[PDB]
Symmetry: C3
Subunit: 123 residues, 3 copies
């Protein structure tokens, strides 16, 4: 295998929270039900959601961000140890197949009011 | 192939714009004519230029930033879909050959007053 | 080989400096003697240390951040040309072996009050 694409994205946490609050429908357009909850069942916070949004944008960049990708066709899930993972379906899986992507790698960070993500697509 | 180097760079957009304005000659030392324009023909903005500068610094880091690299020997170009790409020539191509680099991967982001880039060299 | 993990981390420089000053013992828990010095022998500054901390956090993320990793078992060292490198020992080396990691790639940046690092584990 080799690298097919890389993406980076930085989101301003305050700006992202304001966007979610402005339009009630927005959270459900960007996130699956599972992404909106913490492992315990509590509602996921704004910085953590902003990092997940950054991850989806970074994923889109790694694929050359064609038209037709659905936010909900990229899912950030979490291993027991706390590690974030990408699962792709539908439109995002189809674009990944066009490019030959077999494996996804992601990391998230949030500090100083910004949420950051890096995504590497390999295949 | 495998990874030969990775680079990251973050630039403060306001500081970068101030530098360009202070010294008229600076833009032409850092950027090719093509990089200074948008696809339509309009002049590229400061945040976008700062991200391109960050990309060139990240590229230099991926190569171990030896003396003798010219800014103008790294070019950020843009696919129809909007995706940024690196093309290397001259001094930067020669250093890349020393290390066996065959492929370049880049992504750019700008938010909250900062421009960010990640570059991976593979070969 | 292929990619085993990626990590990113962003640290607020001011917050990190305040933490070091608050607890004298903290620097020695996070850093080896060698990391606390510049090539010349002078004491390494706060932004540079914050970037090294970010690197160790990014490394931990690339390995899935299990319990039991020691800060001091990840070392940032510097090539003559100025390039940062990772050397892993003990607990961090053992976790890397569990995952099959043969090679480490790191880059650091600090601007606009934030220190950033990206780490890729390959094997
Ligand atoms: C293009 C997009 C990925 C950019 O991400 P963003 O977080 O909004 O903005 P960022 O500052 O982080 O990134 C912008 C950079 O990404 C890069 N980018 C743009 N198009 C890209 C593509 N086709 N592939 C890879 N990278 C792309 C560019 O380098 C751009 O900077 P530049 O124009 O100065 O060169 C994003 O806006 C998007 O998903 N496009 C559609 C917008 C939209 O309708 N929202 C999503 C729902 S469909
Ligand atoms: C070295 C250079 C790449 C750093 O990038 P920058 O955007 O200016 O500063 P950043 O904060 O983002 O990066 C600094 C970090 O990059 C790393 N860096 C320095 N030298 C490096 C090299 N040889 N290879 C890879 N990374 C290097 C270091 O880890 C450094 O942090 P540290 O000294 O605390 O360990 C950059 O200053 C440069 O191009 N060097 C020459 C300066 C110059 O004259 N300008 C360019 C025209 S020649
Ligand atoms: C988990 C840890 C790596 C996070 O790094 P940080 O710089 O403190 O915080 P960041 O904002 O940069 O990163 C947080 C993100 O990292 C990711 N992360 C958490 N656990 C992870 C793990 N097991 N593997 C990979 N990434 C992980 C998550 O995506 C998290 O965001 P989310 O919970 O919203 O999804 C770090 O706190 C740590 O080393 N854990 C132990 C804390 C500690 O005691 N200090 C270190 C001495 S043992
Ligand atoms: Mg963005
Ligand atoms: Mg953004
Ligand atoms: Mg820099
Ligand atoms: Mg910088
Ligand atoms: Mg962190
Ligand atoms: Mg952090
Ligand atoms: Na499916
Ligand atoms: Na040439
Ligand atoms: Na050892």
């Amino acid at each position: 295998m080799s690298i097919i694409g890389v993406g980076i994205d930085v989101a301003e946490v305050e700006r992202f929270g304001a966007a979610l609050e402005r339009t009630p429908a927005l959270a459900g357009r960007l996130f699956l039900e599972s992404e909106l909850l913490l492992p315990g069942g509590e509602r996921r916070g704004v910085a953590s959601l902003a990092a997940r949004f950054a991850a989806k944008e970074a994923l889109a960049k790694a694929l050359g961000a064609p038209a037709g990708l659905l936010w909900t066709d990229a899912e950030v899930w979490v291993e027991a140890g706390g590690r974030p993972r990408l699962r792709v379906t539908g439109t995002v899986a189809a674009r990944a197949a066009e490019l030959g992507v077999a494996s996804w790698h992601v990391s998230l960070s949030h500090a100083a009011g910004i949420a950051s993500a890096v995504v590497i697509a390999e295949g």
